Subunit: 198 residues, 2 copies
């Protein structure tokens, strides 16, 4: 799997700086992604200065991209990262914890990384996915019919911005809405250790 940029959504103590097992959430993700990543694009808002200060002495090649609309959602944060990426790129959440085993499989994937065997997360509370012909048909926390769970990890193409731009003029831009509109391919990474902190 060739080197690519990794976009970390850290906008809207900040959640990326919460320590899980003695290590900040964002630091765990960056350490695990670093052998596969040329540059980290960290999209942040109010805590951009706090994250930048934390990361300064860490030894990673990173850029903080700031916006002023945390209320516009994760889909808006992806649109703000458009000019900082080209071709295939990793997209992840700054509030999710992933194991090395999860990361090693996920970086080799395409589209949304989905879990058919969630071992840690509560299925009822999780963002669910209904798959049709290896692509996202339905996505949401309240799906009644579903086959897998959204892990908040993605391997995206520049073609994602074509779908995200269609929602550019809306009040809230949910990332799940872009995923559905793009009919994103699904890659299964089953039963590996991953969890969200909220």
């Amino acid at each position: 799997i060739k080197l690519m940029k990794a976009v970390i959504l850290a906008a809207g103590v900040p959640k990326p700086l919460v320590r899980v097992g003695g290590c900040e959430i964002i630091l765990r993700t960056m350490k695990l992604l670093s052998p596969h990543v040329s540059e980290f694009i960290i999209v942040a808002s109010r805590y951009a200065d706090d994250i930048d200060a934390f990361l300064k002495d860490k030894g990673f090649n990173y850029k903080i991209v700031r916006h002023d609309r945390p209320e516009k959602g994760n889909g808006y944060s992806l649109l703000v990262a458009k000019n900082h990426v080209e071709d295939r790129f990793i997209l992840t959440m700054g509030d999710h914890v992933y194991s090395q085993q999860f990361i090693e499989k996920a970086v080799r994937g395409e589209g949304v990384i989905a879990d058919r065997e969630p071992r840690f997360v509560d299925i009822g509370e999780a963002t669910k996915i209904r798959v049709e012909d290896g692509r996202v048909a339905k996505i949401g926390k309240d799906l009644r019919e579903f086959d897998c769970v959204d892990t908040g990890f993605f391997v995206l193409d520049d073609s994602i911005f074509e779908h995200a731009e269609k929602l550019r003029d809306r009040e809230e831009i949910p990332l799940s809405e872009i995923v559905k509109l793009a009919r994103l391919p699904v890659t299964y990474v089953d039963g590996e250790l991953w969890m969200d902190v909220d």
Copy 2:
């Protein structure tokens, strides 16, 4: 392993026991996993006692909130405050720690401090470490230079713990690790299972 009471230390924005990890509050995950082994939960709380009580009311568990107004005294004081709510062998756990079912199943069958010789998730450098001598705690702390295992924050205690905890009552801060050391607690190994602490500093 016979039914016993479980003491959850939840004293000293959003309180740590109410932080959601994988869509479930930390304290709720621990209680759900402990519930088949536990007769009553004794939750030691301070500032957020009302918030925890209100959260737990509709959950279906048999629990009692034990309050104190000294969170600055530490976890060692929180355990001393639980003395009159327990008799004989009881479980002691932290409200900021996440444990798996596999961890809990082995941990409830243990004695003294549950320690991990193979930590798979937690950062060893940041963890509370333990140096063991003849199956008992010889040294304990976050800055040990010589150690063989990591403190999981899970314990199976006897009423004899209060005899050691009482010795430190007129102290400014009562660290739980200091009581553990003074008691020369036996160690039970639960290796490489899923467990982690949630903190900020």
